[PDB]
Design an enzyme around this catalytic site. Structure first.
Site, PDB file in Angstrom:
ATOM      1  N   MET B 240       0.833  -1.169  -0.027  1.00 49.62           N
ATOM      2  CA  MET B 240       0.075   0.296  -0.092  1.00 49.62           C
ATOM      3  C   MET B 240       0.940   1.184   0.073  1.00 49.62           C
ATOM      4  O   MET B 240       1.520   1.334   0.801  1.00 49.62           O
ATOM      5  CB  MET B 240      -0.723   0.151   1.199  1.00 49.62           C
ATOM      6  CG  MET B 240      -1.729   1.218   0.929  1.00 49.62           C
ATOM      7  SD  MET B 240      -2.902   1.324   2.662  1.00 49.62           S
ATOM      8  CE  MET B 240      -3.374  -0.249   3.267  1.00 49.62           C
ATOM      9  N   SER B 274      -3.309   2.206  -3.610  1.00 49.82           N
ATOM     10  CA  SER B 274      -3.346   3.298  -2.867  1.00 49.82           C
ATOM     11  C   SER B 274      -3.860   3.213  -1.531  1.00 49.82           C
ATOM     12  O   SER B 274      -4.504   2.089  -1.285  1.00 49.82           O
ATOM     13  CB  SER B 274      -4.301   4.523  -3.697  1.00 49.82           C
ATOM     14  OG  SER B 274      -5.626   4.196  -3.501  1.00 49.82           O
ATOM     15  N   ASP B 275      -3.892   3.940  -0.773  1.00 52.98           N
ATOM     16  CA  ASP B 275      -4.428   4.326   0.633  1.00 52.98           C
ATOM     17  C   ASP B 275      -5.825   4.721   0.321  1.00 52.98           C
ATOM     18  O   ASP B 275      -6.314   5.090  -0.958  1.00 52.98           O
ATOM     19  CB  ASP B 275      -3.587   5.033   1.680  1.00 52.98           C
ATOM     20  CG  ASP B 275      -3.814   4.788   3.106  1.00 52.98           C
ATOM     21  OD1 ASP B 275      -4.896   3.995   3.384  1.00 52.98           O
ATOM     22  OD2 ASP B 275      -2.930   5.044   3.815  1.00 52.98           O
ATOM     23  N   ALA B 276      -6.760   4.581   1.134  1.00 50.82           N
ATOM     24  CA  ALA B 276      -8.329   5.373   1.287  1.00 50.82           C
ATOM     25  C   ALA B 276      -8.421   6.522   0.776  1.00 50.82           C
ATOM     26  O   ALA B 276      -8.476   7.520   1.817  1.00 50.82           O
ATOM     27  CB  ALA B 276      -8.892   4.483   2.525  1.00 50.82           C
TER      28      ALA B 276
END
Ligand SMILES: *[C@@H]1O[C@H](CO)[C@@H](O[C@@H]2O[C@H](CO)[C@@H](O)[C@H](O)[C@H]2NC(C)=O)[C@H](O)[C@H]1NC(C)=O
Ligand SMILES: *[C@@H]1O[C@H](CO)[C@@H](O[C@@H]2O[C@H](CO)[C@@H](O)[C@H](O)[C@H]2NC(C)=O)[C@H](O)[C@H]1NC(C)=O
Ligand SMILES: *[C@@H]1O[C@H](CO)[C@@H](O[C@@H]2O[C@H](CO)[C@@H](O)[C@H](O)[C@H]2NC(C)=O)[C@H](O)[C@H]1NC(C)=O
Ligand SMILES: *[C@@H]1O[C@H](CO)[C@@H](O[C@@H]2O[C@H](CO)[C@@H](O)[C@H](O)[C@H]2NC(C)=O)[C@H](O)[C@H]1NC(C)=O
Ligand SMILES: *[C@@H]1O[C@H](CO)[C@@H](O[C@@H]2O[C@H](CO)[C@@H](O)[C@H](O)[C@H]2NC(C)=O)[C@H](O)[C@H]1NC(C)=O
Ligand SMILES: *[C@@H]1O[C@H](CO)[C@@H](O[C@@H]2O[C@H](CO)[C@@H](O)[C@H](O)[C@H]2NC(C)=O)[C@H](O)[C@H]1NC(C)=O
Ligand SMILES: O[C@@H]1[C@@H](O)[C@@H](O)O[C@H](CO[C@H]2OC[C@@H](O)[C@H](O)[C@H]2O)[C@H]1O
Ligand SMILES: O[C@@H]1[C@@H](O)[C@@H](O)O[C@H](CO[C@H]2OC[C@@H](O)[C@H](O)[C@H]2O)[C@H]1O
Ligand SMILES: O[C@@H]1[C@@H](O)[C@H](O)O[C@H](CO[C@H]2OC[C@@H](O)[C@H](O)[C@H]2O)[C@H]1O
Ligand SMILES: O[C@@H]1[C@@H](O)[C@H](O)O[C@H](CO[C@H]2OC[C@@H](O)[C@H](O)[C@H]2O)[C@H]1O
Ligand SMILES: O[C@@H]1[C@@H](O)[C@H](O)O[C@H](CO[C@H]2OC[C@@H](O)[C@H](O)[C@H]2O)[C@H]1O
Ligand SMILES: O[C@@H]1[C@@H](O)[C@H](O)O[C@H](CO[C@H]2OC[C@@H](O)[C@H](O)[C@H]2O)[C@H]1O
Ligand SMILES: *[C@@H]1O[C@H](CO)[C@@H](O)[C@H](O)[C@H]1NC(C)=O
Ligand SMILES: *[C@@H]1O[C@H](CO)[C@@H](O)[C@H](O)[C@H]1NC(C)=O
Ligand SMILES: *[C@@H]1O[C@H](CO)[C@@H](O)[C@H](O)[C@H]1NC(C)=O
Ligand SMILES: *[C@@H]1O[C@H](CO)[C@@H](O)[C@H](O)[C@H]1NC(C)=O
Ligand SMILES: *[C@@H]1O[C@H](CO)[C@@H](O)[C@H](O)[C@H]1NC(C)=O
Ligand SMILES: *[C@@H]1O[C@H](CO)[C@@H](O)[C@H](O)[C@H]1NC(C)=O
Ligand SMILES: *[C@@H]1O[C@H](CO)[C@@H](O)[C@H](O)[C@H]1NC(C)=O
Ligand SMILES: *[C@@H]1O[C@H](CO)[C@@H](O)[C@H](O)[C@H]1NC(C)=O
Ligand SMILES: *[C@@H]1O[C@H](CO)[C@@H](O)[C@H](O)[C@H]1NC(C)=O
Ligand SMILES: OC[C@H]1O[C@@H](O)[C@H](O)[C@@H](O)[C@@H]1O
Ligand SMILES: [Ca+2]
Ligand SMILES: [Ca+2]
Lengths: 754, 754
Positions: B240, B274-276
């Site tokens: 991530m 990706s992150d959130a």
């Protein structure tokens, strides 16, 4: 008749001609800093000829003269050193003669201006130029031809001791002041010395000389622009490299910065000197060579070919091995020749080969040093630097009547000068108490009480202070930080700011905050004056005092300048050169933070009655500035009209002129405003600063009148460093925010680059 | 039948085969994260078929299942998604099924281990691997096959709320723990997810997601190594990327890190998500594209070709424009093809095409989740993580007799879990009070008193506390920081640590410090337990209490684990994973500072009686650690012999083994020591860390016995990044410093690289 002596021959041919007549030994001697004490006894003034002849032969390019002695000791012995070069050496290469000038020529009884962080608050670079010219006059009088300033480092780490020596946290402002300073010095054919190259003043933990974390885009976006203005545009004849490493590369040994950027990109023509003992640091602090016995060769191989041309004293004089390294084949003679050439080109253009004797005669010194013009200018500039932070219900300006309590350690007893003043300067100058007494004369009663010692938690003195306040109509409390002169600073006497004095807290030290609380509780209207070298974190002062005023470390006219403001003869005009945080826990606090910083969630809060209001950024505090960069109030109020751009659709070659009408809504008095222009690059290929000061203008607006203010923005100066580390002005929208501070925006417009 | 279905065909030809049969619409669907709530009602558990069919089509490569619901809601709705993929799609590409595993499988009534910052203090990576193996067991039981951890970010910014989620401040120790954790998870064919790539956890001001200042040498030297061990040596199947920018390049959009380093230099074979909401941030926080309406195309063009393969939910699903970019000629199909390949390759290695169905039956879940093996391990790892800070005059271990006071907000009432715990977890587990009662039974009188609330300055409860102390022979006071579970953290309830809970102070919040002082002043021997997720700055505790104990956020057995140490059934063995500063004003404080940092001048001091001793670094503070990295005491003492090296003159290729004999000098009791080995690169071409942990070993030594410890150092791991950003192990001396902590060195040797 040798060509280098002939002023009708062009500078390059003069350098080429002198360079080919020199031995390797004479080349070395140009690149090593000497010292006046090598032939002048510091206590007696006696002259050591042997000492002169050795110092000229081994380290005669330039020497330092910053000692606390009488004027004649400097003048006579500078003159003797230049007489000796001219008549008793083959080539007669005149000496560069070095001192400090930071806020004043570093000799006893010369004019002292307020500290740099303070005069940056004036936003008046023309007046700063005038200062640099008069400084140059005082120094030139005694034979000096070089000064170790300006400092164009930025105040981006508030715990660091030399914040006071900077022009604040913003690249643009520090750039404009550095330019005007350099130009005013060099008007007198005195060399400036732009320091400290580059990225120095964000040290880890705030500790003096500690290394700096950062990347190349931050170096080129934020750290280098203030060097660039003084160097390319004002034509600075010299540069000092720094003590730090930047992302692991010592400044004194960085080829990329000293050669690729400074020479290849910027076209720099002159010389770089190391800082004091900074050569030795290569082995002793950084551990890039053996420290004991110090590897002199390694030091030299690391720093001379990187582009650091001259070794300063304060180290092991490692550059004496130049001769040995050239004979070993380990250093090419061309590297030496280039460094020497750089020093000599400076000396030709300074005019030193035509007029090497600078000093005026003994009988004129008093007519050139500490003149009225210079004293008056110190009062004027100090007065224009004071920042009105708060003023509730017309508590200022004060009346010249009734009774006035003057309280606090900083109000009297000692002048609260910054660092880079000479021994015992603190025993002359106008204190705040002196200034207040002279402003009122017989028309008001002044009740003075010390209150507390700045260096003690003792509250013995509070009863006298409280009594003073309780029998007065108003109370002035003068508190802050303090530094030390050049002898007392390095003898280890207590301080809160200055070179090698770093803090882990920005709160008022000792008994000062309780002192203020004792005076406020009397119910008498209490005005706090912060007298200091950097931000102080006491948020409670804003709304629990009648008024709050900031005078960064004063000039020798500090108290007259403060009273000019306190009593309204001058309508205060200062704006903050550096942002004020709520707490040392909240750092860094600079206004130009990259997008995605600062403004994140909700701040929590600790109430004084004990309640906690939990937030997120931070749980119990606030990352936003207590006072932002460019903040400053007036006794007047200002009303801005519509912002107006001469061009909307433009090319990177154009100049967009920002125009706006400013009205002084005060009926009774004239007032000065500093209109500030912030540029926002709306959409970018890499992350850029959220906003940037890119122009400003200080205007005096008559009571009730309107003035039109025009600020030029050159489009070429508004770009970024892209992913390939190229400078580009990208096609797209640019916001123009016009205001009274970096947060206090009164109008906007938008232009479009094509 | 097709070659991609054939487990005898090699993975690369399987991927080729599958990719060649996929539409562009099917390829997009692989690179966009789904969510189980798209077909499962969170409250009821009802099934939305329509929802499944839409999710599989548009975002079916992987989906998130981290919701606080019953076990069967995850298991049944995961199986329906995998059934639907197999039976009712063309190609049958099984889903990756994502949750959180940070310190426990994130679902109600699973086994909760102590927080990562805590279990790093164990210095026991084989035991952490067992933990990761049991965690994989619990996740796999419900159909999960990917977990969003380990966190290999470093604790270099102590104001940041996610310090608790890291393995401490050191690259080596975080690399070892990350590797072992990664291996423990992947042993079950559960993909690990190494986060947050890269340089996330030094945000400006400590604020959540704020940008980071640093150069590439720092990134390579300090930030990347922990990623490298987990990725290259443990074979992590996913990564991530982070929310931040590093020197102004967003982590999610950085070609240099995501592609040049990660693929071209490290040969990484799998995928990056990706992150959130991190996609959206390219436009919204970073301002690299229009935010309203958000430029989906620009977001996709910035991140996918940079090397970020997969877009998480929580934003605007910008990758839905992939199809349009390809049609317009703006995105090369081969970029998409490579991103998908990376996802499919991972899926094949996990063995998902052969075993798509993970879940165990409903009847077996109580035999796989919250087993006695997991619970016992939780206690073991927790007791091994506790760090003994002080212990004056043998106050510890305590006697199971007389009277014992148990005081403070964290002693009872709620369990002080860290973040990444599910809703209402805090109402189960063993409190300090619970564990202390069970340890003594009826052999001792236990006198409970809450003392204060953690979130209040109210001191109502102090009398009751004092009274409890006065009638006990000894007192235990449990204070610290607190966090919140996944619902309460995001609904805004008060906290001092956790994701999006950052702080500008490390001092004890609220009444907790005066609570301590009240109990101390009673004359009764006072044991302070710090229960927290990061350092706490209370230097006065060291010498004014009888003993001082650190327990970072506990496991569900925390009270038992704590009791086991306090009464001496376990001889405490924890060593600090992070340095404790004296004040928030002293930051940063990491042990691995570059040469020229930290140790510069004299420190000042503030006496409790008000006296001020002025120094320089700092004027009135100390930049040295209160407790350094690797610090921890024992009830036994350890005597170290001579350090020996099996080789002295060596090459880049060799392995130097460090050997030392360690004697437990306690006659009565067994003791565990963590022998730690620091390397110093004595002379370097660039500025390097002053000392680095490169090896340790935790050894159980019987009473009065001596044990030989052997720690290997591979020479190829001791290099630096030179002026041309190449990794090199430069010939010369390397010092080896063997110790009980990073400060407390007991022996040394030198080897030489030729
Ligand atoms: C005059 O100058 C010379 C320096 O040029 C002094 O001689 C040095 O004496 C010191 C004694 O501490 C020796 O360590 C140096 O090696 C000498 N160097 C040289 C070059 O001579 C001399 O002491 C000075 N004399 C006076 C009276 O001030
Ligand atoms: C600064 O230095 C320059 C160089 O010596 C001076 O300019 C010269 O002045 C003479 C008259 O004395 C002229 O004949 C030359 O043409 C000038 N040379 C150049 C290159 O401009 C200048 O006068 C000095 N300025 C001050 C303020 O002293
Ligand atoms: C801080 O500095 C001042 C000097 O400016 C110290 O004050 C002097 O202390 C000595 C005793 O050591 C006295 O004989 C002097 O007369 C004092 N001078 C003044 C002006 O008071 C002061 O004690 C220092 N304080 C601390 C805490 O170090
Ligand atoms: C079942 O799932 C579908 C999603 O495909 C839901 O349909 C959506 O309904 C909402 C109404 O709030 C709209 O905003 C969306 O635009 C619809 N999307 C599509 C693709 O149709 C449907 O509402 C769900 N039904 C449930 C949970 O009962
Ligand atoms: C993890 O997945 C791999 C790949 O599917 C599994 O290994 C295969 O197991 C079969 C029989 O069960 C063997 O005949 C194959 O030789 C294996 N293939 C490879 C490439 O190793 C492995 O068993 C799985 N592990 C667990 C614990 O489930
Ligand atoms: C911090 O959060 C706690 C909950 O953990 C708050 O205490 C609750 O407050 C509400 C009133 O708003 C009550 O309904 C609950 O009964 C309280 N719970 C407990 C356990 O006492 C507390 O008020 C918060 N504090 C602050 C300052 O925000
Ligand atoms: O004294 C003047 C006033 O006459 C008027 O012009 O406003 C000025 C600024 O006052 C504002 O900012 C500072 C705060 O302290 C005040 O509360 C606020 O009214 C003032 O100087
Ligand atoms: O109680 C034990 C003793 O048996 C002995 O071995 O020393 C241990 C370490 O104690 C030192 O470090 C911690 C400080 O708090 C002590 O004052 C110091 O003696 C100890 O735990
Ligand atoms: O001769 C000059 C004076 O004309 C001038 O006004 O003061 C100078 C500085 O000397 C005093 O202050 C500093 C110390 O170095 C001296 O001891 C003082 O007399 C003179 O040199
Ligand atoms: O700004 C620099 C400082 O960074 C440094 O500490 O001192 C310099 C002045 O150095 C002089 O004094 C000490 C002597 O050893 C040197 O030879 C001098 O040039 C400042 O300018
Ligand atoms: O049926 C299982 C139980 O066997 C297990 O021990 O607890 C699970 C979680 O149940 C609680 O926590 C989460 C909430 O969503 C539930 O409603 C609670 O009962 C069960 O699913
Ligand atoms: O560690 C990361 C965090 O940085 C981030 O804030 O949350 C992630 C979990 O994301 C899930 O929750 C929110 C949903 O919108 C996402 O789709 C999920 O994957 C952490 O792993
Ligand atoms: C200066 O002169 C005095 C004696 O006249 C002496 O004490 C001092 O050390 C001298 N310094 C030097 C360097 O000669
Ligand atoms: C310098 O040279 C001149 C000769 O022109 C001579 O009169 C003088 O004494 C010399 N001085 C020194 C110090 O060598
Ligand atoms: C003081 O009060 C003003 C107006 O109520 C407010 O806007 C300001 O934020 C306050 N300042 C502080 C530091 O509390
Ligand atoms: C403290 O101040 C705030 C101000 O609104 C308030 O919420 C609270 O009631 C006050 N507390 C006390 C004890 O007065
Ligand atoms: C600027 O250019 C745009 C181009 O579309 C146009 O709409 C606009 O009228 C121009 N503005 C001015 C003031 O000329
Ligand atoms: C779940 O079902 C309930 C009623 O059956 C409904 O009110 C609720 O909106 C549903 N939840 C979601 C998120 O669709
Ligand atoms: C999936 O496929 C099977 C036919 O093999 C069919 O029986 C079932 O109805 C299908 N399910 C869905 C949800 O379309
Ligand atoms: C506590 O006392 C010890 C032993 O004298 C000393 O070395 C240590 O520095 C003290 N620690 C603190 C935090 O005062
Ligand atoms: C405060 O403690 C220090 C301890 O060294 C001592 O020197 C000082 O005298 C004490 N304070 C007073 C007021 O005596
Ligand atoms: O140790 C080096 C320092 O010593 C002092 O004597 C000088 O005045 C400083 O400017 C110098 O940097
Ligand atoms: Ca743009
Ligand atoms: Ca080396």
């Amino acid at each position: 008749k040798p060509r280098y002596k002939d002023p009708s021959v062009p500078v390059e041919e003069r350098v080429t001609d002198l360079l080919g007549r020199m031995t390797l030994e004479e080349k070395m001697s140009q690149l090593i800093q000497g010292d006046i004490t090598n032939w002048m006894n510091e206590t007696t003034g006696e002259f050591n000829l042997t000492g002169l002849e050795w110092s000229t032969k081994m380290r005669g390019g330039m020497f330092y003269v910053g000692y606390p002695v009488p004027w004649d000791y400097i003048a006579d012995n500078v003159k003797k050193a230049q007489d000796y070069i001219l008549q008793n050496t083959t080539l007669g290469i005149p000496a560069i003669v070095q001192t400090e000038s930071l806020h004043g020529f570093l000799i006893g009884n010369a004019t002292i201006y307020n500290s740099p962080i303070g005069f940056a608050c004036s936003f008046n670079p023309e007046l700063i130029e005038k200062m640099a010219r008069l400084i140059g006059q005082e120094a030139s009088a005694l034979g000096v031809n070089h000064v170790m300033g300006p400092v164009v480092d930025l105040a981006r780490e508030l715990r660091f001791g030399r914040v006071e020596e900077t022009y604040g946290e913003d690249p643009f402002l520090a750039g404009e002041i550095g330019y005007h300073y350099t130009k005013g010095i060099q008007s007198h054919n005195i060399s400036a010395n732009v320091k400290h190259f580059v990225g120095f003043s964000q040290p880890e933990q705030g500790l003096n000389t500690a290394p700096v974390h950062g990347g190349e885009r931050y170096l080129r976006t934020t750290w280098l622009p203030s060097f660039k203005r003084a160097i390319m545009d004002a034509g600075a004849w010299s540069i000092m490299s720094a003590y730090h490493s930047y992302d692991g590369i010592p400044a004194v040994a960085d080829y990329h910065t000293l050669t690729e950027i400074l020479r290849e990109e910027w076209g720099y023509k002159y010389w770089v000197t190391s800082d004091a003992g900074a050569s030795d640091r290569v082995c002793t602090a950084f551990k890039l060579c053996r420290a004991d016995p110090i590897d002199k060769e390694a030091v030299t191989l690391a720093i001379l070919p990187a582009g650091n041309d001259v070794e300063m004293g304060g180290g092991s004089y490692n550059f004496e091995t130049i001769i040995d390294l050239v004979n070993a084949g380990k250093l090419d003679i061309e590297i030496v020749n280039t460094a020497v050439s750089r020093v000599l080109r400076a000396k030709f253009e300074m005019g030193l080969f035509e007029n090497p004797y600078n000093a005026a005669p003994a009988s004129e010194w008093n007519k050139l040093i500490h003149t009225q013009e210079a004293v008056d200018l110190a009062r004027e500039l100090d007065r224009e630097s004071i920042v009105l932070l708060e003023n509730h219900d017309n508590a200022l300006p004060l009346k010249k009547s009734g009774s006035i309590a003057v309280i606090g350690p900083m109000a009297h007893g000692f002048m609260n000068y910054g660092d880079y003043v000479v021994y015992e300067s603190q025993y002359r100058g106008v204190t705040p108490l002196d200034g207040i007494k002279a402003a009122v004369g017989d028309k008001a009663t002044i009740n003075y009480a010390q209150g507390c010692e700045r260096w003690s938690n003792d509250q013995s003195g509070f009863a006298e202070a409280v009594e003073a306040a309780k029998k007065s109509d108003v109370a002035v409390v003068v508190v802050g930080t303090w530094s030390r002169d050049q002898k007392e600073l390095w003898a280890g006497l207590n301080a809160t700011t200055g070179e090698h004095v770093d803090v882990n807290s920005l709160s008022l030290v000792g008994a000062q905050a309780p002192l203020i609380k004792a005076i406020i509780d009397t119910g008498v209207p209490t005005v706090v004056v912060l007298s200091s070298g950097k931000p102080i974190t006491e948020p409670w002062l804003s709304n629990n005092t009648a008024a709050l005023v900031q005078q960064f470390y004063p000039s020798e006219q500090g108290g007259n300048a403060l009273a000019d403001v306190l009593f309204g003869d001058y309508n205060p005009s200062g704006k903050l050169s550096v942002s004020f945080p709520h707490s040392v826990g909240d750092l860094p606090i600079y206004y130009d933070y990259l997008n995605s910083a600062r403004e994140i969630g909700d701040a929590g809060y600790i109430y004084s009655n004990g309640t906690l209001e939990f937030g997120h950024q931070y749980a119990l505090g606030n990352p936003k500035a207590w006072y932002p960069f460019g903040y400053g109030k007036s006794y007047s109020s200002f009303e801005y009209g519509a912002v107006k751009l001469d061009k909307t659709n433009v090319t990177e070659a154009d100049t967009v002129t920002v125009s706006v009408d400013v009205k002084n809504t005060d009926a009774t008095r004239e007032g000065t405003e500093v209109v500030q222009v912030y540029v926002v690059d709306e959409v970018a290929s890499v992350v850029v600063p959220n906003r940037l000061l890119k122009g400003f203008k200080k205007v005096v607006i008559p009571a009730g009148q309107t003035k039109t203010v025009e600020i030029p923005l050159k489009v070429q100066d508004l770009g970024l460093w892209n992913v390939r580390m190229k400078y580009v002005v990208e096609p797209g929208a640019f916001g123009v925010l016009v205001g009274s501070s970096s947060e206090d925006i009164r109008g906007n417009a938008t232009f479009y680059v094509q």
